[PDB]
UniProtKB/Swiss-Prot annotation:
GO molecular function list: identical protein binding
Tissue: In the Purkinje cells postsynaptic structures. In the cerebellum, cerebellin is much less abundant than [des-Ser1]-cerebellin.
Spans annotated as Necessary for interaction with CBLN3, and homotrimerization: 4-135
Domain C1q: 1-137
Full protein segment contained here: 59 to 193 of 193
Glycan attachment positions: 21
The record's account of how the chain is modified after translation: The proteolytic processing to yield cerebellin seems to occur either prior to the secretion by presynaptic neurons and subsequent oligomerization or in some other location after release of the mature protein.
Cellular compartments per GO CC: collagen-containing extracellular matrix; extracellular region; glutamatergic synapse; parallel fiber to Purkinje cell synapse; postsynaptic membrane; synaptic cleft; trans-synaptic protein complex
Function of the protein: Required for synapse integrity and synaptic plasticity. During cerebellar synapse formation, essential for the matching and maintenance of pre- and post-synaptic elements at parallel fiber-Purkinje cell synapses, the establishment of the proper pattern of climbing fiber-Purkinje cell innervation, and induction of long-term depression at parallel fiber-Purkinje cell synapses. Plays a role as a synaptic organizer that acts bidirectionally on both pre- and post-synaptic components. The cerebellin peptide exerts neuromodulatory functions. Directly stimulates norepinephrine release via the adenylate cyclase/PKA-dependent signaling pathway; and indirectly enhances adrenocortical secretion in vivo, through a paracrine mechanism involving medullary catecholamine release.
Outcome after substituting residue 89 to A: Abolishes GRID2 interaction
Compartment(s) of residence: Secreted; Postsynaptic cell membrane
Protein's name in the database: Cerebellin-1
Length: 137
């Protein structure tokens, strides 16, 4: 179908899991939207069901931050857009960015922590995206 959208948030303060620490893939436990079930909640990865233009937005919140972090949106292991939050001191900072990208069927989109750490949790972090249109209006 031409109705594809997902939305996930971090509803908890909990520290990252062993696997998350190893893969560095930012996990989102609460999924508000998942039309088409194209977002793999277990892997926190979006798999494009068809060719089209997709929109992604993310806001990774570290309310209890220490040391700077880099969050990147990954497309098949390659970084598209990146964002930075924080000074080596303690603060509350958000890593936000957004982009429109073309995806093929089976293409994988996810967030990876290229730099820094998630100690203190990443509560209030959001990750959403949708199909703008498949591949004039």
């Amino acid at each position: 179908s031409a109705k594809v959208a997902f939305s996930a948030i971090r509803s908890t303060n909990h520290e990252p899991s062993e696997m998350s620490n190893r893969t560095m893939i930012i996990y989102f436990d609460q999924v508000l939207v998942n039309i088409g079930n194209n977002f793999d909640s277990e892997r926190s990865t979006f798999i494009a069901p068809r060719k089209g233009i997709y929109s992604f937005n993310f806001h990774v919140v570290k309310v209890y931050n220490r040391q700077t972090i880099q969050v990147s949106l990954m497309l098949n292991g390659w970084p598209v857009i990146s964002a930075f939050a924080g000074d080596q001191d303690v603060t509350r900072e958000a890593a936000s960015n957004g982009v429109l990208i073309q995806m093929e069927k089976g293409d994988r989109a996810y967030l990876k922590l290229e730099r820094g750490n998630l100690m203190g949790g990443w509560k209030y972090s959001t990750f959403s995206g949708f199909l703008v249109f498949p591949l004039s209006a």
